[PDB]
């Protein structure tokens, strides 16, 4: 009859009601994404709103319970999740307007197009068209064109909205007792009450920046090596001591240097670790891919997929006569209903992707025992981390040999190790500075530290300083380049990609330690190990129930995010780089730019 007991009986009703509405919503969202009928877009919104309403109504009611007046770890968590004053904390107009902005920014980005200045007839969308240029084109100017067009068009448009977005979003943040929207976001990493596992919203920046320091040397060398390589691609356009022209990086923003591989490859004479054709030559279908991935998890002591998984999943593009979205996604509908949606092509990329996806599903399964509100990864970085773990083990020539997709011969010579690691750093290491830099600006912009009259002038004061990248054309304030990147002008916390990245390496290490693994860390295949699964499932079964600090500890034995395992994955590379950089300049000068004067 105390306030604790009234709360328990409350959450009890919530769980049972959420489960029903939530399930109706997912089954709806799914039906639409797998079958884009007109009727469906209504139903997806039908259940989509009842579910929203329910939460809103529950949140407001869950508000009438003092969690500060609760002696029970678990319940407090659930309540606080529900005590989402949400947008509602604002006012009729503010909340209305804010959503107007959110939706507008989202539409502009997704719908914005740029047209060829000396061919106004043909316009291109960021996907594909533009993106396709930024990933394959070797023409400096064409690449310049895209890069600039996109920021000069959709960018400029989002500026006004992003400005107000920051305002409205901040009022909201402060009203819920945060310093700013940044503080809000950083919240996801917080832990109150447990001792030794507690964690603060400031502690994140502290831990982020200190761990980033220990990354620079590796990055600077990667930077120097690609720089010299780029000089040969675009002779004359690059300074051996200066930053890298942002439009030459492989994608629209340089979020990943993955497409730089074609022209930064250490030994182009080396051959094929790419079983893409080996799979094809074996007449592999979507079925085999997934049955295989199942087998993989089964080997470490994890359960088969549910009979339901095979009954309800969509493992291939239905083609026409039934269009669908193709972003590979792992579905946790609820009511023990699991399935994946993926327009599977017989690529090595897709073979790995399948393991990443089924990783998520395996996670969703493990934590199904948790009360509804705890059924989620420890933090935004956990689920992605667990998926990347999987790609890592399956990618190894050892595993691929084990499967019989790689010739049981094939010597894993000292050179294919480099080719491989470099193509990994280009994606994995290349993104850290960018990702940190991105949230660093965002963060500060919400804390008032970056005046509206010094926004873009600060974006680049930091891209040059932090990322070693420069703007091929200068930008004043009619520009809003950061919002030019999806997650930004779509309201998503970005630092996840950093902490995820660091996590997955700690995981992989602890698991190859557990899988008793001798070789270099990047050749490890947790496959066929059960004490590996165990050490993992031990944290996989928690979801949000505990503090990540504990969940993470359950696998690594650490109470915090650690850079060192990540550096260890690139130790063989790091040394090679330093050597290659023997007579090359390591570092950059912020003052140089490709347009000068």
């Amino acid at each position: 009859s105390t306030t604790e007991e009234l709360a328990k009986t409350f959450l009890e009703t919530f769980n049972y009601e959420a489960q029903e509405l939530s399930y109706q919503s997912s089954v709806a969202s799914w039906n639409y994404n797998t079958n884009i009928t007109e009727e469906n877009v209504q139903n997806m919104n039908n259940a989509g709103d009842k579910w929203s309403a329910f939460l809103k109504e529950q949140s407001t009611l869950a508000q009438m319970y003092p969690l500060q007046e609760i002696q029970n770890l678990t319940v407090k968590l659930q309540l606080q999740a529900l005590q989402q004053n949400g947008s509602s904390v604002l006012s009729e107009d503010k909340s209305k307007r804010l959503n107007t902005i959110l939706n507008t920014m989202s539409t502009i980005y997704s719908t914005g197009k740029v047209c060829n200045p000396d061919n106004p007839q043909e316009c291109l969308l960021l996907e594909p068209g533009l993106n396709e240029i930024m990933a394959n084109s070797l023409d400096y100017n064409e690449r310049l064109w895209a890069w600039e067009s996109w920021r000069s068009e959709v960018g400029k448009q989002l500026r006004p909205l992003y400005e107000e977005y920051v305002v409205l979003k901040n009022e909201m943040a402060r009203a819920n007792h945060y310093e700013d929207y940044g503080d809000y976001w950083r919240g996801d990493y917080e832990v109150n009450g447990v001792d030794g596992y507690d964690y603060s919203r400031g502690q994140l920046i502290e831990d982020v920046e200190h761990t980033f320091e220990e990354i620079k040397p590796l990055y600077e060398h990667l930077h120097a090596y690609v720089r010299a390589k780029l000089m040969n691609a675009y002779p004359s356009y690059i300074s051996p001591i200066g930053c890298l022209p942002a439009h030459l990086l492989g994608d629209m923003w340089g979020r990943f240097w993955t497409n730089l591989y074609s022209l930064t490859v250490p030994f182009g004479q080396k051959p094929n670790i790419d079983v893409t054709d080996a799979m094809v030559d074996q007449a592999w279908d979507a079925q085999r891919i997934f049955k295989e991935a199942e087998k993989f998890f089964v080997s470490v002591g994890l359960p088969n997929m549910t009979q339901g998984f095979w009954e309800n999943s969509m493992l291939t593009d239905p083609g026409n006569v039934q269009k669908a979205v193709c972003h590979p996604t792992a579905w946790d509908l609820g009511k023990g209903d699991f399935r994946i949606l993926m327009c599977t092509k017989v690529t090595m990329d897709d073979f790995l992707t399948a393991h990443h996806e089924m990783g998520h599903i395996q996670y969703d399964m493990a934590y199904a025992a948790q009360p509804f509100l705890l059924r989620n990864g420890a933090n935004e970085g956990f689920h992605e981390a667990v998926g990347e773990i999987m790609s890592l083990s399956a990618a190894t020539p050892k595993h691929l040999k084990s499967i019989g997709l790689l010739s049981p011969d094939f010597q894993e010579d000292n050179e294919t190790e480099i080719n491989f690691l470099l193509k990994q750093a280009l994606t994995i290491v290349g993104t850290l500075p960018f990702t940190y830099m991105l949230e660093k600006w965002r963060w500060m912009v919400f804390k008032g530290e970056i005046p509206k009259d010094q926004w873009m002038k600060k974006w680049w004061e930091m891209k040059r300083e932090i990322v070693g990248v420069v703007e091929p054309v200068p930008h004043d304030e009619t520009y809003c380049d950061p919002a030019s990147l999806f997650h930004v002008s779509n309201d998503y916390s970005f630092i996840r990609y950093y902490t995820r990245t660091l996590y997955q390496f700690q995981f992989q290490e602890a698991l190859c330690q557990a899988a008793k693994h001798e070789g270099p860390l990047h050749k490890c295949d947790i496959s066929n190990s059960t004490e590996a699964g165990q050490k993992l499932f031990n944290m996989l079964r928690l979801g949000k129930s505990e503090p990540w600090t504990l969940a993470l500890e359950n696998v690594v034995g650490a109470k915090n995010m650690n850079v060192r395992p990540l550096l260890n994955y690139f130790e063989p590379l790091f040394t090679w780089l330093k050597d290659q950089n023997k007579n090359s300049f390591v570092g950059w000068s912020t003052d140089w730019s490709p347009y000068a004067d």
Partner: protein
């Protein structure tokens, strides 16, 4: 006369389970031995015959079948149907996802999730009175007042533990 219990076209909700009495009958039980159509059979007596019984029918969620046994924790066993720690016969169950579940949802089967004090073996509460965790009458929408009866909602694309199961509990005295 067991065919009339097991093959019965419709089953009750656990909160309102049905006890059929059987006396002056002779059955072989072998119409039950020969059955992989059964996902559960845990008896608590034997597995022989004497050709001489209380059959209780209802429906529950797959993961709930575990509670139809002596000792068992709570919710279903606590508030709906509690076997006795004491004596016992058998507990039979079978998946009926194509009978009691639909793609669009089937919420006809109910169960009780709130109450004051647990039920005694074979007790049956079919009351439907707005609940408050501390006595007191109620009047929803009023806060802290909830309706004790709740619907299962069996979707045909759900997990096995979420699919409907018809259960018959034979009791020999």
């Amino acid at each position: 006369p067991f065919g009339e219990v097991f093959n019965a076209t419709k089953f009750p909700s656990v909160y309102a389970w049905e006890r059929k009495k059987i006396s002056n009958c002779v059955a072989d039980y072998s119409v039950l031995y020969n059955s992989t159509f059964f996902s559960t059979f845990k008896c608590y007596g034997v597995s022989a015959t004497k050709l001489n019984v209380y059959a209780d029918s209802f429906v529950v969620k797959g993961d709930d079948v575990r509670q139809i046994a002596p000792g068992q924790t709570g919710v279903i066993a606590d508030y709906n149907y509690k076997l006795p720690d004491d004596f016992m016969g058998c507990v039979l169950a079978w998946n009926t996802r194509n009978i009691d579940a639909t793609s669009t949802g089937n919420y006809n089967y109910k169960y009780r999730y709130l109450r004051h004090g647990k039920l005694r073996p074979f007790e049956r509460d079919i009351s439907n009175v707005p609940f408050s965790p501390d006595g007191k009458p109620c009047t929803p929408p009023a806060l802290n007042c909830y309706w004790p009866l709740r619907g299962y909602g069996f979707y045909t694309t759900s997990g096995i533990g979420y699919q409907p199961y018809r259960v018959v509990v034979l009791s020999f005295e």
